[PDB]
Amino acid sequence: GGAWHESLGKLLEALDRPFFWRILAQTLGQFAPVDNWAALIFSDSSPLILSFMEEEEPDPLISRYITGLYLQDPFYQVSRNCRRGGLFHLADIVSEDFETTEYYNTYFAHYVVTDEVQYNVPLDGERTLCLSLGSESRFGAEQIALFELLRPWVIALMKKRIHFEDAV
Amino acid sequence: GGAWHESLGKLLEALDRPFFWRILAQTLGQFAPVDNWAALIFSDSSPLILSFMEEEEPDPLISRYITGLYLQDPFYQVSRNCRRGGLFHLADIVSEDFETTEYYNTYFAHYVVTDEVQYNVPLDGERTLCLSLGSESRFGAEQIALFELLRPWVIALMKKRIHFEDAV
């Protein structure tokens, strides 16, 4: 104990700061091999990217994701199909032709690499706030178990962060 | 473990709700004999009471506190003298004539009873956000130690709660 309370305080303190999502991903990365991350809102229009690890001349892959490739992102599709939200692991939500999509060979291979989980937080009838955590290795059952253990306050925090998002 | 993460989630979820201070005091009351509580902002004018356990025909003692008796409250005086804020325990901050003040025999005896601690969070050069936790028994060293252990995220949370206070 001890160090966890100071970690929590630093995370709560960042709730109204630009680097909040970086601190949340780094906090969760203490329990799991989080190698990349993105925070975004899915909806019936283009995804709104709130923050991501490699954020900055923008990579044309980001624009391609926003203007169409996100339609092939299994995590976007689950946001339309599982309207209660939750915690999703890549292997549980892919179609069989996932590996044949352009999304897989362009955006995914670069920004996610191997495995992914996402916290999905419905914001209203149309919008879903999502925190994607990617790994160059695999998230195992012990990591998924941890993500579920922490989920009560992860999703509470995410929902409260919306108040300090200006694009929203 | 386990139950603590759900407690934290319920507290973070309440951050924009009227009952936030009640949930914070009840969360801390799991570690200590918190029998009463109040959240308030001290300044160079009258105290602004944000929430308190017995909140509701108002007790004329509350009005008396706000219009003058707070000047004899050792926790108000420490907010003027210790401008970094912190965690304060009653016995460490009283004057010797504390027990002879009207405040002691009227407001304190009713609303606090025996012992008190307060988290003090400076808001600017003049205002101090305070969470008072009172007990009909004494807070011992083990309880003070706990309050200090949790303090990093208690005060981070308190500061963030200001965004959802409308009177402010």
From TrEMBL, chains A, B:
It comes from the Bacteria. GO terms for biological process: regulation of DNA-templated transcription. The keyword Transcription applies. The keyword Transferase does not apply. Keywords: DNA-binding, Transcription, Transcription regulation. GO terms for molecular function: DNA binding. This is Helix-turn-helix transcriptional regulator. It comes from Pseudomonas aeruginosa. The gene is nreC. The chain holds residues 7 to 178 of 268 of the full protein.
